[model samples]
Every structure is written in structure tokens, then in C-alpha cells.
Target: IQHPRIGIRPTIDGRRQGVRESLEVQTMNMAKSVADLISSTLKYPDGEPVECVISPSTIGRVPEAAASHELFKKSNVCATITVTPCWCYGSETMDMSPDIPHAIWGFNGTERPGAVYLAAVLASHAQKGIPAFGIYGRDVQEASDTDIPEDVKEKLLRYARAALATGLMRDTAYLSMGSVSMGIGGSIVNPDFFQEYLGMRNESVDMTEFTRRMDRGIYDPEEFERALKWVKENVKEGFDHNREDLVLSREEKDRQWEFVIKMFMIGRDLMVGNPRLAELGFEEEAVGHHALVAGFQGQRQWTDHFPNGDFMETFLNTQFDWNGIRKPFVFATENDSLNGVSMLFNYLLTNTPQIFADVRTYWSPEAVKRVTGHTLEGRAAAGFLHLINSGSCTLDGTGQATRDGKPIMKPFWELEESEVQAMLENTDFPPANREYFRGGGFSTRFLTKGDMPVTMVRLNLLKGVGPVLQIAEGYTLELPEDVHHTLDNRTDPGWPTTWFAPRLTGKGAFKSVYDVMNNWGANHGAITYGHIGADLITLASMLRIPVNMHNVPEEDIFRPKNWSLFGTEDLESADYRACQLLGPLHK
Candidate 1:
């Protein structure tokens, strides 16, 4: 398959200077060292028969010789070579940076060879669908900071890189290790040097703040309790009932409370100790950029929407017990950065119960619309893919919809009717008792491309399971997309899932994607989308053809060929089912 341009460039101030002599020395030395480590570490009996690939991060982080060394020395290993820059850097920071934060060869307490070699092997493993282990650099640290054990760091880097290079690592590797930035950093080690070596300027996000934030202060129970109280007091209302009802049991509540405490600690620590957190917050900026403003506004909006336990409830509710067939997996896209993946993996590991997740990229919205109503927002498509990939059930706290360009929640039936007609020549019908039939646009049909969401719904209906929890960010779909759209196109009304979309009948219960997004924006979005949100639920519903959300609300009913309110029990009955999903109390 043809791959999209997947790597990000670093911030560049001037033209490329030739590769630094130090970089060359670093690269050659690290490669040789990694090769030797792998060759010496294993014995025949203990080693597993494995094939390793050697790849180079643009900055020379993923070493080429580690796999060879590991296999030749320790276990039965085979090696291959594939070269790419450190696309992982993209995840570490937002916007761009002038320099690569860490040296590819050796700088930190850890060595360079192991880190680079591991990345190469894992990258290859992911490509080949081979299960691999993830390695980290906790054990191998320099004896002293001044001593600057470049060689030691290099050796450790080889092991770390080798472990990560294997795709078989569980989703927990990130959370367990607390290695925050995995892939968001730029691919090129540094701009001037890579431009000289590869004849290409590095374009990537600045991660200094992100790294700094990782080292921030620690959080204790008191602080976490305070944050939780703040979250509860400020979150949006009405949703609180549902939040509490889902897992009101004492044990469940305690379990969730523990998570809240831990996450609080993580956030607090990163913020207090990491100067990078301040940098990310734009403390250094004389003025803020659009991204920063949006980010700040989003944070506030996040707290407001999920006031009360719902904010924490959803986080706690997301944990899955891995006793049965379920396992943890990660979903990745070409757009992901090292930091983004690191954050995403960490969040998934800590938040959800599943241990492993499979990574795959769906077609873009600009590229396809079967997933979304129209190819309005590619991000929506991305979101849908995440939902589909999440297996069985997915949940979103906030659900929303908009009419025209204006942002409005709780849109009346008439407005929905008008918008449907204007956009898709479709109309919704509303009855006096709120028990009528409405139909237009497309009935949830199977997509020629993929319908992972529908598949999940189908499973539920077939198996007769309870309502699946599916979450949406910012009222679900965002309208109006130019081939190249501006961020202004994205707007958030207070309610995440607006009345129009939420009221519609469906097989799942959507919480607030807004809350989830707030807690973990793009990083969180990546984890849940394609992994657990719309596609999984929608596709599952389609298979069993589960009822739509409209069934609960008697006010707006949908009339379709095989659904009805009266006894005919055919397509005409679907409108009634839509009403039923809403519950009889709703008029």
C-alpha cells in the first residue's frame, strides 16, 4: 500500500549547515556498540528465534546495529535495514522547535545505542505484524551526570530501542515506564545537521516544554481530592445523574476514585516540576497563538461540561477487566507524533482495562464519506475509526450537532428538519406526543469501505447486551469543510452531543467526548477514536441493526421501511423503536 508522508519536520530558523562531526561520531559509535550488545547478550536456550530490523531515526535515535547485536550475541535473531527520521518527535511538542531535545547517540543517563536499535526493531515489527517487546531505560543510567557516560547511555539506548522496536509490547509499556514522549518529537535530530545529511529541512513540534512538564512535581491525595472537587462543582449539569447511575456501587466508586487520585498526581507532577508545561501553556509567549488559545479555552470548557463526578466517573468507568477474550491494543495514524503516541499509549494503559490495541489508519474524510454523513471533517472520520477499533462497546460523554455555521445545542425538531433538507434533502418528523416518525438523509447503511462501529452494534443486538457506552467530542459531527479548512470551522456549544444527534435512536449510550477530549485532547482522541468510539458502536448496531436513540424521545420519530409504531412490525416500526430507545417518560 502507498504510504502518506508520515514524518513531521522540526522548527527551522536558518538554512542547513552540514551534519555536525559530533553527530557522525555519535552515529557510527552507537551503531557499532548496539551491534556488539545484541551479539553478546543472549544464549541459545534462553533466546527466542527472532528477526530484527535496523532503522535510523532522522536524528540517528533508532540504531541500525542493535538488532544484529542482540540476535548474534544473545538469541537467534535475524536483521533487516529500513531507514526513517524520528517521526516520533512529532508527538512530544506542539508547533515546531529549532533543536532536537535529546541527542540521538548519548546525552541522558541512558545510552543511545539501545534506544535507537529498539525503535528500529519495533518499527519493523509493527510493519510486519510480528509481536515484539517494549524496552525502557530505567536500569541502565550513567554513574554520574558530570561523567557523561555516553557509551553507557548508548548501550542502554540499544536495549530500549530494541524492546520498543518489537510491536508485541502490551499497551501498558508506556504507562508502566512513564516514558512520556514516545513519538511526537521531530524525526530529524536537529535542523542544521539533518538538512546537511539528508538534504531536507526538519519540520516538527517543539517538545522542550513537554519534556520539562514530565519532570514536574508530584501530586498527593489532598491535591487530587481538591481537583476532583473542583471538577465536580464545575462540570455541566443533568449529565451527573447518568454518570453516577452507571457505576454507583461502592467498590466501583472507590476504584474510580483511586484512578482520579493517580491521574491528578501525574498531571500535578508534570505541571509543577516541568518548565515545559509552562512553555506549553505559553508563559513565554508575549501573545498566544491560535492553537494555544484553543487549547486553553478547551481546558476551561472541559471542566464546565462534566461538573460533578461525571468528569471522573467516565474516566473510571472506562477501565476494562481483561479476564476474558478482551485485550489491550493501540490505534495509530500516520499523523501521530512520538509524544502523541506516548501520551495516548500511557492514557490507554492507565485508563482502560484492555492491555493491547491494534493500530491501523482509516481512509481520510477528504478521501471518503461513508463513515461520516458527508466528508465535512476528516477528524470526524478519524474519530469514527477510533470508535470502530475499540472493540465491543465504546463510550462518549458529550454529544453535539450544529445547524448551518451557528453553534446551538438542543436544536428543535423543526430546525433539524430544515437543516436536513438544506444539507441532504432529508427531513425529520416530529409528533405531538413526541412519538412520530422522521426520516431522511441516509439510514445507517453498511459502508463499502469499512463499518467497524456497525459491527460492534450488531454484536450487541445479536447477543442482547446492554447499551454500549460511546463517547463523542464536541457534539459529534462538525460541519462545513473546505478541502483546506481553518480551525474556526470547529466550534463547541456547551453540550457536547447536541439534542438533534443525541435524540436520534441508536444502540449505544454516548457520554461526553468533550470531557474525554478535555481530559486528553488529541492524544485521548487518538486512543478512543478508531479504537472505541463511533465506528465500534455504529458498526455493531448495524450488524444486529440495533435501535436508534430517537426511540426514547417521543417528540421526534423516524419513519423507515422496516420500522413502525403500530403492530405492523416492519420498517414502519423503526420510528416507534426510535421512540422506545428514548424511554416512555420522554414526551
Candidate 2:
């Protein structure tokens, strides 16, 4: 999206004498203030500030609401959040359309009944089978003051970020580069879930598509040469760890590297087709799948004959490439659509590169002392989970790229060329594991620097329960240098690894790091920068997906007001109840 915009509407009481007239300024200013907060705080994946479109006139009734709708629809607004400073007609001013995400923010402090309209309108939405998030200041503010209170800003920004993410996914495509991989259920590529739950199309292509493009050279030759040159210059080659009998020769390795570079180029082209291909006499190949997210099934049949897709997957999912820094391509290896959706969600919410990994191991404190003869300290004191993947994770996970002195993955647009080089400097490409891949490729290898705030997340589909999300907000744990090497070498040393110690809430799945790992819905989870569980929760609620696990504070949880109606005693169960009742948004 060039600049995803939120539509802001000011709703007023219909009374003419002094009621509507007196409060018009207050209502409009609320809309303006809300817009200011969201625009200043939120940015898209490209690092551009979120745009806002205010209605030309205040909406007080059906005609005005419809008029505002026309303006918003014409502006291609992604979500709508209506504002009111006084008691207003509920149904008449509500966003009736069920397609986009909706929310209502009423002034908590008012000479008139501001909270009254927020409650009545939200109730009206619930009665009419519409789910809308409700927001109001915790404490009353001065009537003339238009500045958004802190609590209101928190909820409003959360809703806006999640809503924008939810809204942005509509009408996009999920291009599965291949079908199921080695019986991965996530690779089954259910069109039903994609269409109904995310409002996204599923485009599944055979693995032969890569071969077809390669055989015909359906890529830009100039860019191919440049990309290969950059790879050779910047991407360092790590020591070969293949078996003596199975090790590839230098000539063979070079051939495989060339093949992988072309394969990734073809994969990128497949998601968003290149016009140059049309100039190269391939008109149809230029029209891509228009996918916002994609997956590659490369573990079995494809990797048996050709170089594996590790390089392809990692390069696509990474924040920068031969073309320079840019937004990451949401990609999953082995065609895990579930984890792909998780990465997609996190990327949209945080506007940062996401790390896709297997919840590989839980290194208990006891095991740590036994293995490394060193006590686990700091964030790794209790225990930590080793999140490792063959190669599909982003190189930005190295944590070399930062904003301040502390480690942080800045947005692609904000990344400097030096930071990009720094990230590459921290990464090495080792020859693919021969035992795993008959044909040769390269796997990214790096140890993620620790102490950066991160949130681990995954989306899972169940037979009886539909979709459920799991989240853990935590920090990356750093061990003593030698300790990391000992543990790192045990697993495939050629693979990227991040030691994660999830925050413990002493409740449910978050009772301990082990509990979070034990309760993870799937083998794969997408970890992105910062503690973003609150945003993930809000976004899941909008999509009618229940959050099965999270470590976010109870006070920070904000779903629709209908959630409290289910059961205020425990929000975890209440979220489940509300999602089950509401069902999938598109369905």
C-alpha cells in the first residue's frame, strides 16, 4: 500500500437549537486529535506515516453517514473509526458495512452523555451482529479539551494498528510456490481458510514453475548478473560441513550457487511479476500472483534433484537483497501456510523483518550446566528455547542493524547501507546439509545477538476450533561466547539460531518458558522485534481468531466490548467465547 489511510468521522447529536451546534467543534476536534495520534505514532511496512482522511462534514444521521461512507470508499480508506463528543443516534451514525474493520471513540468527558452514545452505539453494533472495538478515556477530561488522553491514545493506537493490518490484508493473494511439503499440514494450503478468514486468495503452483522459468531464462539478465556479483562480493562462504564422501566439488558448488540465485530471482518474480519478462517475450509470466505472502515447498522432491530452496526462502524473507534494503517478502519454507500467516501478521503490525524458526529445543537450566559447565544467567537463568531454522529466517535477526546503540531491526526505509552491510557481515552461508538435501545449496548461519525485545507468534488451524493464535513477548538471551558455540554446534551449526527466554506470567501457558514452548500450537513460530502481543491480540480479535496463549499484561488486553460481556473474570476464556460466537469475519 502506498499509504494506507484511516477514515475519521465526527458524529454529532441531531438536535438543532444548541445541542448539535455547541458540540460540533468538540466532535470534529476529537476526530482531528485521534487522527493526529495515529498518524504520528503509526507507520506502514515502508516506514511512511499512516495517513488519515477526515470527513468533509460531521455525520449526525443516515444521510450524513452514507455520505461519509461514499467519501471514505472513494478515498480507498482501509478502516473507519467514528468519533462523537455528545449523545448521538446509535444505528443511524454507526458504520453499517460489515466488510472493513470498525471502531467508535466517544469523549469520556462531556457536558452531554458521551459515554452513553459509545455504549449505546457499541451495543447497537453487537445487537446487529457487527463486531466493533469501543474506546473512551479512562478518566473524564475537560469538555473543551480535544487532546486525546493517555489511556484513550493507547487503545486507539492499538486498534488503529491492528485495524490497518487487518484492512491491508483484504483482496491480496497467498501464493504457495508448491503444494504440501513432506506432509506438513500447514502446507495443505486450504483455500477455504484463506478466502473466508483472511479474505485472501490462494494461488498454488507446481514446483516445475521454477524449472520452467529457469529453462527459458524468464528473468532480467542485467539484474541477475548484478545480484550474483553482489552475492559473491558480500555474502561470505562459511566452512563446508558435508560428509567427506558426499561433499560437493568447488565447481559443483559454484553451479549450485548460480542455480539458487536464479531460483530465488524466479521466486521473487513469481510473487510480483517483473515487466521486463514481458519484454523478454514472456507476456503471461509478467503477470504475477499478486501475493502479499508466499511459501516454498523444497524439502523433499524439489531438493532431491536441484539445489534446495534455503537460499531462495532466506533471501526472499530477508529485509535487504542485491537490490538494496526494502520491505521483506513474507516467505515460508516447506510451504507452512500457518506460519506464513503468522509472519504476515507480525510484519504488518511492526513494520520490521520477521524471523521464522522451528521451536527446536528447550534448554533447561539443568541441561545448560551439564552441557556447557556454565550456569545460565540473566534472561536465560530459568531456561531458554532455542529457535533455529535451516535458513528461512531473516538475516536482520543478527541484531547488527540497530537504531540506537541497543539492538533493533529498523524498517527497510530507515536502514542505512552501512547497517545493511553490517547485517550481511554478521551472516555466513554454509553449504547445505548433504544428508538433508541431495542437491547442494547454501544455508544462512548466524547467532542472534541477545537482549532485544521480541514477540514470538504463530497461527494454527484446528478441526473443531477453526484458527487460534499463540504469542509470547520476551527478550533474546545471550549466553557466554563459548556456551553458545557448544550448544550451537550441537544443532546444525550452519543454521541461524536465536535463544529466546519467554516472559513468565505465572499463569496458564506462560507459567514458565517451558510452558510456553510446551503449549505452542505448531513447530513453527514467527518472531519479530518488540513486544507486540497486544497488537497481535487486537488484530486476531478483529479477524475473529481466538488467541490461545499470550504473556501480555491483563490490563493491556483490549478486544471488543462484547468480550467483557462473555466473562470479565478471565479474559483468556472470554476471548475464546467472543471469537467462537462471532466466527470468521469473512464467513
Candidate 3:
């Protein structure tokens, strides 16, 4: 996989006099330090270390900046950072590319006044309608010091990671398998939004694709046997929630299990291709949709007749499978392309599987006490958000997996046998709700443990405004055993549940848990591990998507320096205005 590269620009005085000569080594040194920092800390989703491309030589004037720009294009640099240790002409030396995300780091050394150049170039960027992030160390260092300060390093890594995630999605496809499910607005595929805002293409296939492959024996036979064996051994069945009279015979249940496992194989093959299909003489199926994310519309039509897609989606979205640990596929339930893209963003940024869930319900503290006869305390004292969904929730959402003694949803490559076993042990497959699915299938069930920091993100499209992202940073809470059982039983017991409490800031959307729920733009939100609101803000800015609602701290917020020109008083309104003025980047 080709990864996005970072370009470093070392600028200085244009003069050929002693001043320019004196700063040459320092400038290049700063560039090298920045490159090393990025190279050591960041990586692509595939676990490859991020590449950094530096200018052939230090840039001093317009000609040099232009030459470096050409190199950046050749190197596939999607983000650029201009570094300087001394005074330089702002408008003449700064990067002018409106498409690529730009940033500047001014050495905080009083001996050379690098901060002056940072401020001046940012002003020039604002005036020219090019947004750029500005980085300046809080403490001043010696003139020759090459060390990147802790604060500056944090800002740089955050910006670069988010920028790279934005670039990675460019030219990828969103595969929608089947059409709308139950008349969901998000299921109504919007090609214009994917094309203009995300630089993504839209692909579709009728639900019959599953039957075409399964009926024709198009998948790998040997792997199917192995998968079946693994499923029989590792996947333990839970009590069937259906009434005894309505339950399917044991043989029928076994057949349904086989059908669902084959669906998983075919679904993955459809998204990214399988060499085995070519051997099976299905030339067309050998090549995939080239999709980075996908969704299945299996609610009514498909699940109404055949086994539901729940089994396929749950395992595919998990970090490990019968083949061993590997990258989890991003798939949405109900063919919600918007939610699929939301999961993609979170996965790309964190290199971890995402939890796809409905913004199902808000359980106030009073409601919890009334229902469970238990007082909610700790993070749950303020109430909690119920994040539950029938399918497409990763088994890792069980929170049984851990790293360094702390719970985390790790990348597939880092997943271990112990973690996988713990995850499987924590999860159970309950019979799909018979009321919703006449055909027999199983849904994943687990309750997310407490104290794990998380961020829920959603992307919404409006008639006039192209796309807007909403973020709520919060923590998962563990209810009392009796309380959890009571609440979990009330909802569809087959679905996965995550109890969330947003960190309140006492203003607007963050004013209360209810406010956050009220402000959510859609039915589903992608939940990623950790407090990544700052990271999401950076990524949204890179994509030119205004963040309509977020509870991130003011100091942690990093956006284009030009946004300050829009107006500092109300960032949310300013973001909307700026995004409207600039429009979509790919458009």
C-alpha cells in the first residue's frame, strides 16, 4: 500500500550574504529533526512506518519554494510543514498550495526571532486564503538547539496523523451491498457527497451477489472447511431467545450456520478480492470492488428469507478470525454509507477496529434508579448514553482485550492469542430477534466494561452544507451487576451494549448528557478507543469539514491558522462560514 508522505520545508533569509550562510546548517538541522520525529512516531494503517521527504536543500526564496513544491508532488506528500530558525520573507517563502494541508514551526529562540517569521507567514497564509496550522514552542531554546519541544512534538504528530488519514481515503471506494434497509436516509447512497467531499467513489451490488457466489460454489473450499471447524470449536452458542415452539430444528440451525460463514467469506471477497476465486473459474469475482469500507442492507429483504448478516458482520468487523489476526473490515449495518465512512475515519486515525452502534437511548440517572433500584455513581452519576446495535459492532467492543494491563482495542497485527481468547470468552451469540428477523440468525452480545476513554464521531450531510462532523468525547462505565442485567435485558438482548458518559463542559452541547444526545446528527456514531476529540478536529479541518459540535478543550483544538482570521469569538459559526466560502476540496 502506498502511504501518504510528509514534506519538510526549511526556509531562511534569501540573501547570499553572511546572514543566509550562517543559518543554513541550523535550518537543515531543524528539518532533519522534524523528519526523524515523524518517522519514529507515526505509521500507516498497514503498520508501515510513515515516510518523510525533505527538500533537496534549504529553501530561501520563491524559486526554492517552487522547486520544493515540485518535489513534494513527486513524493506524494499530502501534508507539508515549513520550518525556520531565522527571519524570512513571509509571503515569498511560505507554501501557497491551497489543496495540501500546510503547517509552520518557528524555532522559539530569541537569538534568531523565528517566532516572528511564524506569525508573519501565518498572516500571509490567512490573507491568501490558504489555511495552515502554526506551531511554536512555549519555551525558548538556544539558537543552535535542534531538539523538538514536548508541546511542539505533540501538536505536530496530531496534525500529521490526521492529515495522513484524510489523504489515505482519497480515491478509495465505498461499496454498498444491496439497497436501502427499512427506508433509512443514510442507506440512500449519495454519490455526490462521496465524490466531492471525500474524493471517494461509490460502488454497489445487488443482494443477489451473495446468492450468485454461494450457489455457484465460487469461494475457497479448503478455507471454508477450516472456518467451519473453527466456528464449531471456538464460537459458543448462547440460549436461543426465541420461544420453544418457534425455534428451528438442530439440523436447520447447523445449515444456517454454514450459510452465514459462507456469507462472511463471500462478503470479504467482494470487498477486496480473493485469489481463490480466480482458481474457481469466476474471473469477474476475482477482482473486487476496491472498497476501503462497505455496508450490507440485510435488515428486511435479505434477512427476511435467508439467514441474517449478523454472523458475517460481527466476525468480519472483529480483529481476528479463523485465518488468524488481520485487519478488521469496516462494514456498516443497514447499508448506512455515512456511518461506514465514519468508521473508516476512526480506523485510519487509530489503526484499531471501530465500534458501530446506534445512538440508541439516553438513560438519565433518575431512569437508572427507577429501573434497576441502584444508584448510578462515578462517571454514570450524570447519566449515560446507550450505544447498541444488532450487527456490525466489533467483538472487541466487549472490552475484554487488553494492552499493558489497560483495556484497548489493538490493531490486528498486535493482537495476541490471550487477547483473542478473552474476547471470544466475553462474547456470546444470541438468537436474532424473531420479531425483526423471520429467518434464523445470531447477534453478538456483550457489555462494554467501564473506565475506558472513548470518542463517538458522526458525519452528516445537509442540503446546502456539504458535510459536517460531530464529536463527543466520553468514557465507558460499568454498571452494578444487577443494574446492568436489568437494563441489558430490557433492550434486545441479542445486541451489543456500550454505556457512555460524555465529559461535560457546561456549555452548549456539552452542557449536559441530554444536550449531547439532542445534538447528535444521526442514528449511528463510530466509537474509537481513547479521548481523540483533538485528533478528530484536526482531521475534519484537513478534509474541509466544519465540526458542528465537539466538547474538546480549547487548548487541544488545532486548526488552520487562517481560521483565526474568520473570527475568534465563535469558532463553530466561523468554521461553518469558512467551509462554505472554501467549499469542498475535491470539488
Find the 10 residues in a row with the least total lDDT in model 1.
Answer: 437-446
For every candidate, C-alpha RMSD to the true structure in Å: 24.9, 1.4, 1.4
Colliding residue pairs in candidate 3: none
In model 2, state the lDDT of residue 571. Answer: 83
- Estimate candidate 3's alpha-carbon lDDT, on a 0 to 1 scale: 0.87
Ranking of all candidate structures by their TM-score, best first: 2, 3, 1
Error of 1 at 214 (Å): 28
Give the number of colliding residue pairs in candidate 1. Answer: 174
Question: Total clashing residue pairs per candidate?
Answer: 174, 0, 0
CA lDDT scores, all candidates in order: 0.25, 0.87, 0.87
* Colliding pairs, model 2: none
Give residue 139's error in model 3 in angstroms.
Answer: 1.6
Per-residue C-alpha lDDT of model 1 across residues 170-244, encoded as one tens digit per residue: 111111111112332211122232122112222222323222432443333354566557434432222112223
